Amino acid sequence: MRSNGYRRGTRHRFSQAFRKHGMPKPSILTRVFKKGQYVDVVVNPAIHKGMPHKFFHGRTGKIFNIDKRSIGILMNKRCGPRYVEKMVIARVEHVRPSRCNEEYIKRRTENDRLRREAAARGEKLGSLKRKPGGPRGAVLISTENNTPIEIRNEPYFEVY
Amino acid sequence: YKEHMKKEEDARREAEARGAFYVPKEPEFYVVVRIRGIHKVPPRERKILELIRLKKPNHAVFVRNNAPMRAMLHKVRAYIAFGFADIHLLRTLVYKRGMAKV
Amino acid sequence: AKRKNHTNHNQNRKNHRNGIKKVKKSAPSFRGLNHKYLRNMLYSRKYNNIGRAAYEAEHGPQQ
Amino acid sequence: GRRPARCYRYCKNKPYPKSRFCRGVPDPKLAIYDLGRKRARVTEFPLSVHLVSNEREQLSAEALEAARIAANRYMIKHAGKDNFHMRIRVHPLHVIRINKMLQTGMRGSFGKPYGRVARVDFGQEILSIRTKDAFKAVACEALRRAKAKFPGHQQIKVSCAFGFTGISREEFERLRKEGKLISQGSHVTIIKEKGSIVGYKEKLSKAIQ
Amino acid sequence: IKEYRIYGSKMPTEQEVAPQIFFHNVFAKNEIVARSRFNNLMKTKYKIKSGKIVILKIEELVEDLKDMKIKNYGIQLVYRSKKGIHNMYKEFRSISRCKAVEMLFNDMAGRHKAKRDDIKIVSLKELRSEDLRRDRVIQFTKDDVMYPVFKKVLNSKYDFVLKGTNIFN
RNA sequence: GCGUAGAGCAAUGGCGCGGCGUCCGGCGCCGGCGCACCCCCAAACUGCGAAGCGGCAGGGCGCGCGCAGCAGCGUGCGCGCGCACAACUGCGGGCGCCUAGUGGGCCGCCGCUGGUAAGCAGCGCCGGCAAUGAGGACACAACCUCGUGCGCGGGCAAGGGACCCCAGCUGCGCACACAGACGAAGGGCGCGGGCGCGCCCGCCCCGAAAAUGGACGGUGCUCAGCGCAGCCCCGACCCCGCGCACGCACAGCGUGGUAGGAGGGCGCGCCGGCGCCGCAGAAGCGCAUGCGUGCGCAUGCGUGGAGGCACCCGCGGCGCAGAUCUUGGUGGCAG
Numbered sequence A: 001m002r003s004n005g006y007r008r009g010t011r012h013r014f015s016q017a018f019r020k021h022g023m024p025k026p027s028i029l030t031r032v033f034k035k036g037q038y039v040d041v042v043v044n045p046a047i048h049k050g051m052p053h054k055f056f057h058g059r060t061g062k063i064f065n066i067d068k069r070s071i072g073i074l075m076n077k078r079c080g081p082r083y084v085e086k087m088v089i090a091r092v093e094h095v096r097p098s099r100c101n102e103e104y105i106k107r108r109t110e111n112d113r114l115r116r117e118a119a120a121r122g123e124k125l126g127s128l129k130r131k132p133g134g135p136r137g138a139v140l141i142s143t144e145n146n147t148p149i150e151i152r153n154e155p156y157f158e159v160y
Numbered sequence B: 001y002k003e004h005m006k007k008e009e010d011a012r013r014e015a016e017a018r019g020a021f022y023v024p025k026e027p028e029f030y031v032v033v034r035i036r037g038i039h040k041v042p043p044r045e046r047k048i049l050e051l052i053r054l055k056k057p058n059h060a061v062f063v064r065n066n067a068p069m070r071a072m073l074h075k076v077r078a079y080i081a082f083g084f085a086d087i088h089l090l091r092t093l094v095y096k097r098g099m100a101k102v
Numbered sequence C: 001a002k003r004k005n006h007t008n009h010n011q012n013r014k015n016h017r018n019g020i021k022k023v024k025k026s027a028p029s030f031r032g033l034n035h036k037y038l039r040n041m042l043y044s045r046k047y048n049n050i051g052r053a054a055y056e057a058e059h060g061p062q063q
Numbered sequence D: 001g002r003r004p005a006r007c008y009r010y011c012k013n014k015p016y017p018k019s020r021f022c023r024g025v026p027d028p029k030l031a032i033y034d035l036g037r038k039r040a041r042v043t044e045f046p047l048s049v050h051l052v053s054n055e056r057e058q059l060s061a062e063a064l065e066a067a068r069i070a071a072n073r074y075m076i077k078h079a080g081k082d083n084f085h086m087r088i089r090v091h092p093l094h095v096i097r098i099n100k101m102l103q104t105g106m107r108g109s110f111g112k113p114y115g116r117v118a119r120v121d122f123g124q125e126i127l128s129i130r131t132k133d134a135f136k137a138v139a140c141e142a143l144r145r146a147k148a149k150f151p152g153h154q155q156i157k158v159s160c161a162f163g164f165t166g167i168s169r170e171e172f173e174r175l176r177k178e179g180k181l182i183s184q185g186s187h188v189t190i191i192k193e194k195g196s197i198v199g200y201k202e203k204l205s206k207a208i209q
Numbered sequence E: 001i002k003e004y005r006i007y008g009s010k011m012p013t014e015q016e017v018a019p020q021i022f023f024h025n026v027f028a029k030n031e032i033v034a035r036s037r038f039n040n041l042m043k044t045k046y047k048i049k050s051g052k053i054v055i056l057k058i059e060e061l062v063e064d065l066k067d068m069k070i071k072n073y074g075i076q077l078v079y080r081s082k083k084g085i086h087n088m089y090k091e092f093r094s095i096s097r098c099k100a101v102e103m104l105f106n107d108m109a110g111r112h113k114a115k116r117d118d119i120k121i122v123s124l125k126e127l128r129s130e131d132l133r134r135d136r137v138i139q140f141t142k143d144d145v146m147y148p149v150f151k152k153v154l155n156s157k158y159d160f161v162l163k164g165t166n167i168f169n
Numbered sequence F: 001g002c003g004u005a006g007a008g009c010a011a012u013g014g015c016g017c018g019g020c021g022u023c024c025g026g027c028g029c030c031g032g033c034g035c036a037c038c039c040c041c042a043a044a045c046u047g048c049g050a051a052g053c054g055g056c057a058g059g060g061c062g063c064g065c066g067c068a069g070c071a072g073c074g075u076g077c078g079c080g081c082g083c084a085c086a087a088c089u090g091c092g093g094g095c096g097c098c099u100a101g102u103g104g105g106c107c108g109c110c111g112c113u114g115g116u117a118a119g120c121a122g123c124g125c126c127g128g129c130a131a132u133g134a135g136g137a138c139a140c141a142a143c144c145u146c147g148u149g150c151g152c153g154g155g156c157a158a159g160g161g162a163c164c165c166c167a168g169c170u171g172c173g174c175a176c177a178c179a180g181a182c183g184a185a186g187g188g189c190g191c192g193g194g195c196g197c198g199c200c201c202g203c204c205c206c207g208a209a210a211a212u213g214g215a216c217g218g219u220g221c222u223c224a225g226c227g228c229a230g231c232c233c234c235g236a237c238c239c240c241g242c243g244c245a246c247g248c249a250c251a252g253c254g255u256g257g258u259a260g261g262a263g264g265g266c267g268c269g270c271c272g273g274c275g276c277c278g279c280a281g282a283a284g285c286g287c288a289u290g291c292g293u294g295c296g297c298a299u300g301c302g303u304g305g306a307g308g309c310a311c312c313c314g315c316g317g318c319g320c321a322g323a324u325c326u327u328g329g330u331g332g333c334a335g
């Protein structure tokens, strides 16, 4: 029932944090961007031009296009029973380079290096799967210098 | 099986020969029984019971003792009874009611 | 007469019967690309294994 | 002409104060929130008794005035007009509405401001009396004359705190002897080692004892 | 019900190799309630939640009833009603510790409708006759106490029998 | 990424008293104002901020060479060589075409909005009814259990186990009010426990008044009430096992169904054929028997008195319980 302007209901979404107002720092201009790189759209409300829709303010998408001042981003949206790919054009002030695949890239470049080096020496490594947290280990807790302490239920008293 | 179990009992009584407390490594699997019926299940809980292959009540499976599987068992813990089978419960479940998916 | 205005009831159940289908994979499109970049990429594809100086030595002024 | 208080008993709505959006609400009849000897110093009334709500409900401003007069008349007639300071804790900030409907019925149902209520919680003090220790039984009796005016269950508690400060009577007595308290009338400030030392010595200059 | 002494601690990590061992004496129906009552006390006395607790030992504290006399037991408990949470001290005479708390549970249920899960036991102490504070349990500590049975009890299961047949005696 | 619950008065906006003052006014006091503490606060307040959710990632990489009008020293794109299968669990998946019905909903849970409230009105999420039988709820669209072919055997669920009515015994308490069996503020030297005469906890009592005679479902029950423990039992189409039917891509798995769609058959008038039957009795009809999940089919006997059947094909005015259906006949009413 609410009105359907382009920034509807963005009182908190398109605000600035406490003691973090102001125009963006020039250090954002030294960020590289490449096609295929994932980015997080998070709107800088001090920058009024090139602002994406409020729908994409939490979303993360892959860059398909790179412009003079802006970036094209592929972001899927649910339209009923389907994901529809939207092309989001955003200024670079409204995006951050995403750390979504940050630990995957760190894992991949090391593991691909280790597979290359093992193939160089004629060996091979079978599987470098991430092992999840299994069962608990067996423990040994000695009572040497660690005496067991009784926990008791205590009588209910109230302070007033 | 007897040698593995005897080694843990010998590890446990030697620890209480000293002051220590020894609990072994907890088993590599849970045994899970579907308790509640198939009705009125929310879509997350209905999905987890599908991935545990528990599609009717009084059905039992083994799930791995993983950290992701423990979180799956926790979210449907109002629908299942789960715990730790020893080797006697493992072998009784498979030899008495054990079929193959071929 | 006055009746129900709106509900989203049964909509998530409807939308998951045939599932939430993904974006259907396609050939890569030049829709949305930078025009100066796309113009230059096609020039690199046009003169891919033969250089431009060798291409215009054959076909004359290619513009 | 006033509706019964069972119509506006419970905290049904979101809190709805007098604001720029809700104007035209009349003034509450609860006019006074501090009775007895208000100007009495912090160290004159050690005892503190509280009327505490055992309900989540809305106390009417009319009941807040009626329990005010019932408790104030009893403390005057029995403890005397100088031997107490009774503070009304809750303030009637929530505005209740009346539809009042030719008879429109439920069309355009949002009501006009009808009255003011105070919204209380479980364990929230409604009234509080600070007295000398001799008038414990008087102050317990004046509060049970106040809770007759109130809906639901209330409980009279004798608090171990010293008067209207949060500090307990044993802990207040120690810091009063240490010189660590500066009075603010009904409440008090505890002198800490956090200031500049020239300001700390001015703080000990203005202490209680 | 049974008595359990359940030993547990924080799960040892590389930062804390030997955590402090705790134990709780629980009167519970089984070990799963006993683990549950242990996990709340580690959650509320300390801040160790149950995901980071290893339960080191669970033992059944069972008394030897070799000659089976009746002892006196003074039970300090904390029970939660529908209205609040209160302290009570009840005295019972019984066989064992695990039977005396069964007398506590049936009495708090009969007299106060306190369910078994609404009751936390502060302490259970076996007492002398001289230290008993309830005069009702003191009467049966006297030697040579005697009373008759006034309730009629049947000597079989009957539906209908003739009038001459003794059924009570 | 969020800004809800909570929390906070620190900014915005309110609330309220004291305290302080080389502040102002009036006559030390009173009132203003200022400051500091504090108080009550906020759907349209926020220095904080959960539970909970949302997005994305968990696979291709490395190297080399070509190309560009882009760029000014990169970025893309071609091509080659080499490396290589990436948490857990489950499991076949993707896409297209045509078309129906639907577009009055309702209910429960949790979260809400309006309203004195409503079996009221309006939302969110999930589940249900609608279209979901069966068991338990005395009966009872939605509650609980739980799904559902046709049977047999077992075991149970919810719920129960005085008699109706399948199934109960052993112990420990408590209560007396035509109570249990709708209820408030406020009460009770009523009884049972507990704490320091006052409190607290259970049960009971008073407050407690409606109109056909009457409803813990009934009988009734004062150990059939209110509590507990132990062992046991009863109880669904659930679960298990077996057998059969049907469907499936068929060492097996599956089985509810309105609107709706689809498939395969049954039946009717006639057609092109093809096998036949009939005055030693055809169709039709009546009563039987049999077959068949079912649509229906076949026979026997009786009647009937001249046609008919089966199958394959083809055409269709092709199947009735309803339409205040149409037409005809006949009842009850009613001697």
Ligand SMILES: [Mg+2]
Pocket: none
């Ligand atoms: Mg502009």
Ligand SMILES: [Mg+2]
Pocket: none
């Ligand atoms: Mg009236």
Ligand SMILES: [Mg+2]
Pocket: D012, D013, D014, F113
């Ligand atoms: Mg409301």
Ligand SMILES: [Mg+2]
Pocket: none
């Ligand atoms: Mg808020």
Ligand SMILES: [Mg+2]
Pocket: none
């Ligand atoms: Mg809040």
Ligand SMILES: [Mg+2]
Pocket: none
């Ligand atoms: Mg309605």
Ligand SMILES: [Mg+2]
Pocket: F132
């Ligand atoms: Mg059902």
Ligand SMILES: [Mg+2]
Pocket: none
């Ligand atoms: Mg039913």
Ligand SMILES: [Mg+2]
Pocket: none
């Ligand atoms: Mg029924």
Ligand SMILES: [Mg+2]
Pocket: none
């Ligand atoms: Mg049985």
Ligand SMILES: [Mg+2]
Pocket: F165
């Ligand atoms: Mg019977």
Ligand SMILES: [Mg+2]
Pocket: none
């Ligand atoms: Mg079945």
Ligand SMILES: [Mg+2]
Pocket: none
């Ligand atoms: Mg069917």
Ligand SMILES: [Mg+2]
Pocket: none
């Ligand atoms: Mg149909």
Ligand SMILES: [Mg+2]
Pocket: none
């Ligand atoms: Mg024919």
Ligand SMILES: [Mg+2]
Pocket: none
């Ligand atoms: Mg035929």
